[PDB]
């Protein structure tokens, strides 16, 4: 089968800049290549067919070139909703094969997170488990530290983080940190705090509550 | 216009078989072939096979002996069936249609069907409020202890979408998934507007609507 | 670099 090599694997640019995706084939495929866009939780979207031919409803800032083994997909003025992975497909040789994709990230100005903390609901406490959630909202860049403290004891190993993909509108990330503990442990303590470190804060922000207000 | 609607996601036991139905509208199966493509962590995008207008099938080489594609023109249905699934067959499966009847440039895609191959048992989630406590209030829902992926979450039956973040599910040590969905709203609307997260875990047909209020 | 079923996006 034809091996399609896409490079680089990550691509980070700023809005309005031109960007180019690379797709190289293991042997000549003429111009028998198609390009696809995949947004978060989306299905692939056909952008270019046969190296350079336009597709209905696709913005004109998408174009493609190349022939033989070296092919390029180009966006001349990157927009925020262009955040996605981009895939090439060959069909000169059966079976049709796809590249491994290139991720396109967007740069933007530093944005400090807004921090919120939620105690476990009384509903969940009926089940014998307590979840404490700390939300970091609409920040950039992605790197962030979340430190948990219970009665000034550092928590380690009993929290999990999840991070959204970049937002299509404002290019920010959001993060959730969930501290999980047994109800017995949760009842044996009072002060619950998440401390948040981020480039956009001059000093760490701590959101805390005391169990039972 | 042209649409492809696939059947819902689900669990399949190892060494067992997979069945997906693709229903099409905006065109006839007698005029177009329908392709099947999957997307997995192990191998990325993979072309699996196609059923053509006249009923002939082609299957990609590593699938000839465990893949079967059938259709019902009158009912606009294409049936995908694959035998003896293992763990690396966990993937999102799409049906797809090309621009022209004979070609392979896939301009129309189904929404995908996430198939999880595992010996474990299906379990619906519990939904718990994340209650609100610069005039912007955050609130959400904790969708906890379900298997397998995915779960869909919306707010106020689709009417609230601005400021919504639904985080990727994380696998807990229990082998069960968990996620939270959050939204920021004006705090002055908390006494006037109702906020409900609509949770649906189709693998277990568990549908929960959780009202989230200030505690 | 690997595709993630949770987000339908490439992660690492």
Short mmCIF file of C-alpha atoms in Angstrom, two decimals:
data_model
loop_
_atom_site.label_atom_id
_atom_site.label_comp_id
_atom_site.label_asym_id
_atom_site.label_seq_id
_atom_site.Cartn_x
_atom_site.Cartn_y
_atom_site.Cartn_z
CA UNK A 1 0.00 0.00 0.00
CA UNK A 2 1.00 3.64 -0.48
CA UNK A 3 2.39 5.21 2.69
CA UNK A 4 1.38 8.85 3.15
CA UNK A 5 3.69 10.85 5.44
CA UNK A 6 2.33 14.09 6.88
CA UNK A 7 4.64 16.71 8.35
CA UNK A 8 4.98 18.31 10.79
CA UNK A 9 2.79 16.53 13.31
CA UNK A 10 1.91 19.81 15.14
CA UNK A 11 1.58 23.28 13.59
CA UNK A 12 1.19 26.45 15.68
CA UNK A 13 0.47 29.79 13.96
CA UNK A 14 -1.19 33.15 14.63
CA UNK A 15 -4.41 34.41 13.00
CA UNK A 16 -4.05 35.99 9.58
CA UNK A 17 -0.84 34.08 8.85
CA UNK A 18 -0.48 31.71 5.92
CA UNK A 19 0.01 28.04 6.80
CA UNK A 20 1.04 25.01 4.74
CA UNK A 21 0.49 21.30 5.38
CA UNK A 22 2.80 18.66 3.90
CA UNK A 23 1.81 15.23 2.55
CA UNK A 24 4.42 12.96 0.96
CA UNK A 25 3.69 9.65 -0.78
CA UNK A 26 5.93 6.59 -0.85
CA UNK A 27 5.74 6.51 -4.66
CA UNK A 28 4.28 8.74 -7.36
CA UNK A 29 0.50 9.11 -7.23
CA UNK A 30 0.15 11.83 -9.86
CA UNK A 31 -2.44 14.26 -8.50
CA UNK A 32 -4.68 11.63 -6.90
CA UNK A 33 -4.83 13.14 -3.43
CA UNK A 34 -7.68 14.53 -1.33
CA UNK A 35 -7.49 16.67 1.82
CA UNK A 36 -9.77 16.55 4.86
CA UNK A 37 -10.49 18.65 7.94
CA UNK A 38 -11.60 17.11 11.24
CA UNK A 39 -12.88 19.39 14.00
CA UNK A 40 -13.33 18.36 17.63
CA UNK A 41 -16.02 15.66 17.85
CA UNK A 42 -16.59 16.09 14.11
CA UNK A 43 -16.54 13.86 11.09
CA UNK A 44 -13.93 14.44 8.36
CA UNK A 45 -14.78 17.28 5.98
CA UNK A 46 -13.56 17.22 2.37
CA UNK A 47 -11.50 20.34 1.57
CA UNK A 48 -9.62 19.65 -1.67
CA UNK A 49 -9.95 16.90 -4.28
CA UNK A 50 -7.27 15.86 -6.79
CA UNK A 51 -4.54 18.03 -5.25
CA UNK A 52 -5.98 21.40 -6.25
CA UNK A 53 -9.70 21.29 -7.13
CA UNK A 54 -12.17 23.34 -5.12
CA UNK A 55 -15.09 21.90 -3.16
CA UNK A 56 -18.54 23.45 -2.85
CA UNK A 57 -19.10 25.47 0.32
CA UNK A 58 -15.40 25.47 1.32
CA UNK A 59 -13.91 28.93 2.02
CA UNK A 60 -11.60 30.22 -0.69
CA UNK A 61 -8.67 30.53 1.73
CA UNK A 62 -8.17 26.76 1.35
CA UNK A 63 -6.02 25.70 -1.60
CA UNK A 64 -3.77 22.82 -2.56
CA UNK A 65 -0.86 22.10 -4.88
CA UNK A 66 1.62 19.36 -5.69
CA UNK A 67 2.08 16.38 -7.99
CA UNK A 68 4.06 13.16 -7.95
CA UNK A 69 5.04 12.56 -4.32
CA UNK A 70 5.05 16.00 -2.63
CA UNK A 71 1.73 17.77 -1.96
CA UNK A 72 0.76 20.87 -0.01
CA UNK A 73 -2.47 22.12 1.53
CA UNK A 74 -2.43 25.86 2.20
CA UNK A 75 -4.47 28.38 4.19
CA UNK A 76 -3.40 31.92 3.33
CA UNK A 77 -5.05 33.69 6.30
CA UNK A 78 -5.60 31.38 9.27
CA UNK A 79 -8.82 31.92 11.20
CA UNK A 80 -9.76 30.70 14.66
CA UNK A 81 -12.33 28.16 13.44
CA UNK A 82 -9.59 26.53 11.34
CA UNK A 83 -8.40 24.76 14.51
CA UNK A 84 -8.51 21.07 13.61
CA UNK A 85 -6.52 18.13 12.30
CA UNK A 86 -5.89 17.88 8.57
CA UNK A 87 -5.58 14.63 6.63
CA UNK A 88 -4.50 13.67 3.13
CA UNK A 89 -5.83 10.69 1.19
CA UNK A 90 -4.42 9.01 -1.91
CA UNK A 91 -6.37 6.98 -4.45
CA UNK A 92 -3.96 6.34 -7.32
CA UNK A 93 -3.37 2.80 -5.98
CA UNK A 94 -5.93 0.47 -4.42
CA UNK A 95 -6.63 0.57 -1.57
CA UNK A 96 -7.14 4.24 -0.81
CA UNK A 97 -5.01 5.23 2.18
CA UNK A 98 -4.84 8.16 4.58
CA UNK A 99 -1.98 10.04 6.20
CA UNK A 100 -1.58 10.32 9.95
CA UNK A 101 -2.70 13.96 10.12
CA UNK A 102 -1.24 17.29 11.23
CA UNK A 103 -2.73 19.27 14.13
CA UNK A 104 -3.14 23.03 13.65
CA UNK A 105 -3.05 25.12 16.83
CA UNK A 106 -3.49 28.87 17.07
CA UNK A 107 -1.43 31.35 19.05
CA UNK A 108 -3.10 34.19 20.92
CA UNK A 109 -2.43 36.63 23.73
CA UNK A 110 -1.98 35.36 27.28
CA UNK A 111 -5.32 35.01 29.08
CA UNK A 112 -5.43 34.22 32.79
CA UNK A 113 -7.97 31.58 33.87
CA UNK A 114 -11.09 32.27 35.87
CA UNK A 115 -11.15 29.80 38.76
CA UNK A 116 -14.24 28.21 40.31
CA UNK A 117 -14.53 25.46 42.92
CA UNK A 118 -17.53 23.24 43.58
CA UNK A 119 -18.09 21.14 46.73
CA UNK A 120 -19.61 17.67 46.35
CA UNK A 121 -23.37 17.67 46.11
CA UNK A 122 -25.37 16.20 48.97
CA UNK A 123 -26.78 13.86 46.32
CA UNK A 124 -23.35 12.35 45.61
CA UNK A 125 -22.58 12.12 49.33
CA UNK A 126 -25.49 9.66 49.61
CA UNK A 127 -23.48 7.31 47.38
CA UNK A 128 -20.48 7.26 49.74
CA UNK A 129 -18.13 9.18 47.44
CA UNK A 130 -17.17 12.85 47.29
CA UNK A 131 -16.02 14.73 44.19
CA UNK A 132 -14.50 18.22 44.48
CA UNK A 133 -14.21 19.98 41.12
CA UNK A 134 -11.94 22.95 40.36
CA UNK A 135 -12.64 24.69 37.06
CA UNK A 136 -10.09 26.80 35.18
CA UNK A 137 -11.98 28.65 32.45
CA UNK A 138 -10.91 30.21 29.15
CA UNK A 139 -7.16 30.60 29.54
CA UNK A 140 -4.05 30.57 27.36
CA UNK A 141 -1.53 29.04 27.01
CA UNK A 142 -2.46 25.48 27.91
CA UNK A 143 0.14 24.91 30.66
CA UNK A 144 -1.32 25.22 34.16
CA UNK A 145 -0.76 23.80 37.64
CA UNK A 146 -3.55 22.76 40.01
CA UNK A 147 -2.52 22.00 43.59
CA UNK A 148 -5.06 20.51 46.00
CA UNK A 149 -4.96 21.01 49.76
CA UNK A 150 -7.15 19.52 52.48
CA UNK A 151 -6.56 21.07 55.92
CA UNK A 152 -3.21 22.24 54.47
CA UNK A 153 -2.31 18.64 53.57
CA UNK A 154 -1.05 18.41 49.99
CA UNK A 155 -3.16 16.00 47.95
CA UNK A 156 -1.29 13.73 45.55
CA UNK A 157 -2.53 10.93 43.31
CA UNK A 158 -6.25 11.39 44.04
CA UNK A 159 -7.16 13.96 41.37
CA UNK A 160 -7.62 13.82 37.61
CA UNK A 161 -7.42 16.58 35.00
CA UNK A 162 -9.29 17.04 31.75
CA UNK A 163 -8.59 19.80 29.23
CA UNK A 164 -10.76 20.95 26.35
CA UNK A 165 -9.40 21.33 22.87
CA UNK A 166 -8.82 24.89 21.74
CA UNK A 167 -11.98 26.96 21.45
CA UNK A 168 -13.00 27.71 17.87
CA UNK A 169 -14.09 31.27 18.71
CA UNK A 170 -11.52 32.71 21.15
CA UNK A 171 -8.70 30.10 20.96
CA UNK A 172 -8.67 29.50 24.74
CA UNK A 173 -8.52 26.31 26.79
CA UNK A 174 -10.51 25.26 29.82
CA UNK A 175 -9.46 22.73 32.45
CA UNK A 176 -11.27 20.72 35.10
CA UNK A 177 -9.51 19.20 38.11
CA UNK A 178 -11.53 16.63 40.07
CA UNK A 179 -10.42 15.56 43.55
CA UNK A 180 -12.02 12.23 44.47
CA UNK A 181 -12.18 10.97 48.04
CA UNK A 182 -14.35 8.72 50.17
CA UNK A 183 -17.24 10.27 52.09
CA UNK A 184 -15.66 9.16 55.37
CA UNK A 185 -12.46 11.01 54.50
CA UNK A 186 -14.40 14.03 53.23
CA UNK A 187 -16.33 14.28 56.50
CA UNK A 188 -13.08 14.14 58.52
CA UNK A 189 -11.82 17.46 57.10
CA UNK A 190 -12.86 21.09 56.70
CA UNK A 191 -10.80 23.34 54.39
CA UNK A 192 -10.75 22.35 50.69
CA UNK A 193 -8.62 24.49 48.39
CA UNK A 194 -7.34 24.34 44.83
CA UNK A 195 -4.40 26.59 44.02
CA UNK A 196 -3.95 27.53 40.37
CA UNK A 197 -0.68 28.55 38.72
CA UNK A 198 -0.63 30.11 35.26
CA UNK A 199 1.51 32.48 33.20
CA UNK A 200 -1.30 35.05 33.11
CA UNK A 201 -1.44 35.43 36.90
CA UNK A 202 1.11 37.49 38.80
CA UNK A 203 0.61 35.17 41.79
CA UNK A 204 -1.34 31.93 42.34
CA UNK A 205 -5.11 32.09 42.80
CA UNK A 206 -6.69 29.95 45.51
CA UNK A 207 -10.38 29.07 45.59
CA UNK A 208 -11.52 27.32 48.75
CA UNK A 209 -14.56 26.38 50.80
CA UNK A 210 -15.22 24.90 54.23
CA UNK A 211 -17.39 21.77 54.30
CA UNK A 212 -20.84 22.79 55.49
CA UNK A 213 -20.17 26.49 54.75
CA UNK B 1 -29.69 17.59 1.20
CA UNK B 2 -27.54 14.45 1.31
CA UNK B 3 -27.29 12.86 4.77
CA UNK B 4 -26.06 9.61 6.29
CA UNK B 5 -27.36 8.62 9.75
CA UNK B 6 -25.70 5.69 11.50
CA UNK B 7 -26.98 3.59 14.38
CA UNK B 8 -25.93 4.34 17.94
CA UNK B 9 -22.69 3.51 19.73
CA UNK B 10 -22.34 0.36 21.74
CA UNK B 11 -20.25 -2.27 23.46
CA UNK B 12 -19.20 -5.56 21.85
CA UNK B 13 -17.61 -8.52 23.61
CA UNK B 14 -14.23 -9.77 22.35
CA UNK B 15 -14.42 -12.54 19.72
CA UNK B 16 -17.92 -11.24 18.86
CA UNK B 17 -19.52 -9.44 15.94
CA UNK B 18 -20.32 -5.82 15.11
CA UNK B 19 -23.43 -4.52 13.33
CA UNK B 20 -24.01 -0.94 12.16
CA UNK B 21 -26.84 0.44 10.04
CA UNK B 22 -26.32 3.46 7.79
CA UNK B 23 -29.54 5.17 6.66
CA UNK B 24 -29.21 7.62 3.78
CA UNK B 25 -31.43 10.36 2.40
CA UNK B 26 -31.10 12.95 -0.33
CA UNK B 27 -30.02 10.29 -2.87
CA UNK B 28 -30.65 6.68 -3.85
CA UNK B 29 -28.51 3.65 -3.05
CA UNK B 30 -29.18 2.49 -6.63
CA UNK B 31 -27.21 5.50 -7.91
CA UNK B 32 -24.31 5.68 -5.42
CA UNK B 33 -21.94 3.37 -3.62
CA UNK B 34 -21.56 3.60 0.16
CA UNK B 35 -18.11 3.29 1.73
CA UNK B 36 -17.10 2.32 5.25
CA UNK B 37 -14.17 3.96 7.06
CA UNK B 38 -12.97 3.61 10.64
CA UNK B 39 -10.66 5.68 12.83
CA UNK B 40 -8.70 4.05 15.65
CA UNK B 41 -5.79 4.99 17.91
CA UNK B 42 -3.76 2.11 16.50
CA UNK B 43 -4.05 2.90 12.80
CA UNK B 44 -5.85 6.22 12.31
CA UNK B 45 -8.11 6.49 9.27
CA UNK B 46 -8.65 3.15 7.51
CA UNK B 47 -10.73 2.37 4.45
CA UNK B 48 -12.66 -0.85 5.13
CA UNK B 49 -14.89 -1.52 2.13
CA UNK B 50 -17.74 -0.37 -0.09
CA UNK B 51 -21.01 -1.62 -1.53
CA UNK B 52 -21.62 -0.29 -5.03
CA UNK B 53 -24.89 0.76 -6.67
CA UNK B 54 -25.40 -2.68 -8.24
CA UNK B 55 -24.67 -4.66 -5.07
CA UNK B 56 -21.05 -5.67 -5.65
CA UNK B 57 -18.68 -5.31 -2.70
CA UNK B 58 -14.98 -4.70 -2.23
CA UNK B 59 -13.26 -5.29 1.12
CA UNK B 60 -9.83 -4.01 2.12
CA UNK B 61 -7.34 -6.88 2.21
CA UNK B 62 -6.98 -7.40 6.01
CA UNK B 63 -10.79 -7.65 6.34
CA UNK B 64 -11.94 -9.90 3.47
CA UNK B 65 -12.76 -12.85 5.74
CA UNK B 66 -14.53 -11.06 8.61
CA UNK B 67 -16.37 -8.22 6.82
CA UNK B 68 -19.82 -8.28 5.23
CA UNK B 69 -21.67 -5.30 3.71
CA UNK B 70 -25.32 -5.53 2.64
CA UNK B 71 -28.03 -3.04 1.76
CA UNK B 72 -31.76 -2.57 1.19
CA UNK B 73 -32.33 -0.10 -1.65
CA UNK B 74 -36.05 0.31 -0.92
CA UNK B 75 -35.34 1.23 2.72
CA UNK B 76 -32.20 3.29 1.92
CA UNK B 77 -30.27 1.20 4.46
CA UNK B 78 -26.69 -0.11 4.31
CA UNK B 79 -25.72 -2.85 6.77
CA UNK B 80 -22.15 -3.21 8.05
CA UNK B 81 -21.19 -6.40 9.90
CA UNK B 82 -17.73 -7.45 11.11
CA UNK B 83 -16.83 -10.71 12.88
CA UNK B 84 -14.49 -11.65 15.73
CA UNK B 85 -13.64 -8.24 17.12
CA UNK B 86 -10.63 -7.73 19.37
CA UNK B 87 -9.50 -4.76 21.44
CA UNK B 88 -7.70 -2.96 18.62
CA UNK B 89 -10.98 -2.98 16.68
CA UNK B 90 -12.16 -0.31 19.13
CA UNK B 91 -12.71 2.66 16.83
CA UNK B 92 -15.20 5.13 15.40
CA UNK B 93 -16.88 3.70 12.30
CA UNK B 94 -18.27 5.92 9.54
CA UNK B 95 -20.29 5.30 6.42
CA UNK B 96 -19.48 7.70 3.62
CA UNK B 97 -20.46 8.63 0.06
CA UNK B 98 -18.28 10.05 -2.72
CA UNK B 99 -18.98 12.97 -5.06
CA UNK B 100 -19.52 10.69 -8.06
CA UNK B 101 -20.85 7.15 -8.17
CA UNK B 102 -17.48 5.52 -8.99
CA UNK B 103 -15.00 7.61 -7.01
CA UNK B 104 -13.46 7.78 -3.52
CA UNK B 105 -13.47 11.49 -2.56
CA UNK B 106 -15.75 11.32 0.47
CA UNK B 107 -17.88 14.47 0.53
CA UNK B 108 -20.63 13.14 2.82
CA UNK B 109 -20.08 11.34 6.14
CA UNK B 110 -22.22 9.74 8.78
CA UNK B 111 -21.85 11.09 12.29
CA UNK B 112 -19.76 8.05 13.22
CA UNK B 113 -20.38 5.11 15.53
CA UNK B 114 -17.97 4.62 18.43
CA UNK B 115 -17.56 0.89 19.04
CA UNK B 116 -15.87 -0.30 22.23
CA UNK B 117 -14.55 -3.88 22.33
CA UNK B 118 -14.36 -5.05 25.93
CA UNK B 119 -15.47 -7.91 28.14
CA UNK B 120 -16.85 -5.48 30.73
CA UNK B 121 -20.47 -4.56 31.39
CA UNK B 122 -22.47 -1.54 30.29
CA UNK B 123 -23.30 0.90 33.08
CA UNK B 124 -25.26 4.14 32.95
CA UNK B 125 -23.96 7.27 34.64
CA UNK B 126 -25.06 9.18 37.71
CA UNK B 127 -25.54 12.92 37.20
CA UNK B 128 -24.67 15.35 40.00
CA UNK B 129 -24.96 19.15 40.10
CA UNK B 130 -22.01 21.50 40.18
CA UNK B 131 -23.90 24.30 41.88
CA UNK B 132 -23.22 28.03 41.52
CA UNK B 133 -22.08 29.67 44.75
CA UNK B 134 -17.64 39.91 38.13
CA UNK B 135 -21.29 38.96 37.77
CA UNK B 136 -20.46 35.73 35.91
CA UNK B 137 -21.52 32.48 37.58
CA UNK B 138 -20.21 29.03 36.64
CA UNK B 139 -22.31 25.88 36.98
CA UNK B 140 -22.34 22.40 35.57
CA UNK B 141 -23.04 18.69 35.81
CA UNK B 142 -20.83 15.81 36.92
CA UNK B 143 -21.50 12.76 34.74
CA UNK B 144 -19.90 9.94 36.68
CA UNK B 145 -19.28 6.18 36.56
CA UNK B 146 -20.49 5.07 33.13
CA UNK B 147 -19.24 2.58 30.56
CA UNK B 148 -18.51 2.67 27.78
CA UNK B 149 -18.04 5.99 25.99
CA UNK B 150 -19.67 8.15 24.71
CA UNK B 151 -22.14 10.30 26.58
CA UNK B 152 -23.86 13.30 25.01
CA UNK B 153 -24.53 16.39 27.11
CA UNK B 154 -26.45 19.51 26.14
CA UNK B 155 -27.97 22.40 28.07
CA UNK B 156 -31.63 23.48 28.16
CA UNK B 157 -32.54 21.06 25.35
CA UNK B 158 -30.10 22.71 22.95
CA UNK B 159 -31.10 26.33 23.64
CA UNK B 160 -27.96 27.15 25.68
CA UNK B 161 -24.64 26.68 23.86
CA UNK B 162 -22.65 29.84 24.56
CA UNK B 163 -20.08 29.45 27.33
CA UNK B 164 -20.52 25.65 27.43
CA UNK B 165 -17.52 23.36 27.90
CA UNK B 166 -17.95 19.58 28.04
CA UNK B 167 -14.62 18.10 29.06
CA UNK B 168 -13.20 14.89 27.59
CA UNK B 169 -14.07 11.82 29.61
CA UNK B 170 -11.34 10.39 31.82
CA UNK B 171 -11.06 6.72 32.75
CA UNK B 172 -11.10 6.16 36.51
CA UNK B 173 -9.23 3.39 38.34
CA UNK B 174 -12.57 1.57 38.59
CA UNK B 175 -12.60 1.17 34.80
CA UNK B 176 -15.55 3.57 34.57
CA UNK B 177 -15.56 6.91 32.81
CA UNK B 178 -16.39 10.31 34.25
CA UNK B 179 -16.71 13.83 32.87
CA UNK B 180 -18.04 17.25 33.76
CA UNK B 181 -19.90 19.76 31.62
CA UNK B 182 -19.78 23.42 32.63
CA UNK B 183 -21.28 26.69 31.46
CA UNK B 184 -20.84 30.30 32.54
CA UNK B 185 -23.95 32.49 32.74
CA UNK B 186 -24.80 35.91 34.18
CA UNK B 187 -25.34 35.56 37.91
CA UNK B 188 -28.42 37.79 37.68
CA UNK B 189 -30.14 35.09 35.61
CA UNK B 190 -29.86 32.43 38.34
CA UNK B 191 -33.11 33.49 40.01
CA UNK B 192 -34.95 33.86 36.69
CA UNK B 193 -33.72 31.15 34.30
CA UNK B 194 -33.70 27.40 34.82
CA UNK B 195 -30.55 25.47 33.91
CA UNK B 196 -30.70 21.79 32.97
CA UNK B 197 -28.03 19.53 31.55
CA UNK B 198 -29.48 16.88 29.25
CA UNK B 199 -27.43 13.69 29.59
CA UNK B 200 -27.87 10.68 27.32
CA UNK B 201 -25.76 7.52 27.57
CA UNK B 202 -27.06 5.59 24.56
CA UNK B 203 -25.07 2.36 25.23
CA UNK B 204 -27.32 1.90 28.29
CA UNK B 205 -30.27 4.04 27.08
CA UNK B 206 -29.92 6.09 30.27
CA UNK B 207 -31.37 9.57 29.73
CA UNK B 208 -31.17 12.01 32.64
CA UNK B 209 -32.08 15.70 32.88
CA UNK B 210 -30.38 17.32 35.87
CA UNK B 211 -31.60 20.67 37.19
CA UNK B 212 -28.73 22.74 38.59
CA UNK B 213 -29.59 25.44 41.15
CA UNK B 214 -27.62 27.54 43.64
CA UNK B 215 -27.27 25.60 46.88
CA UNK C 1 0.45 12.29 17.47
CA UNK C 2 -2.09 9.60 18.29
CA UNK C 3 -5.78 9.87 17.61
CA UNK C 4 -7.99 9.99 20.67
CA UNK C 5 -11.45 8.40 20.60
CA UNK C 6 -12.62 10.66 23.44
CA UNK C 7 -12.08 13.96 21.58
CA UNK C 8 -11.86 12.73 17.98
CA UNK C 9 -8.63 14.76 17.85
CA UNK C 10 -4.92 14.02 17.66
CA UNK C 11 -3.24 13.98 21.08
CA UNK C 12 0.52 13.48 21.07
#
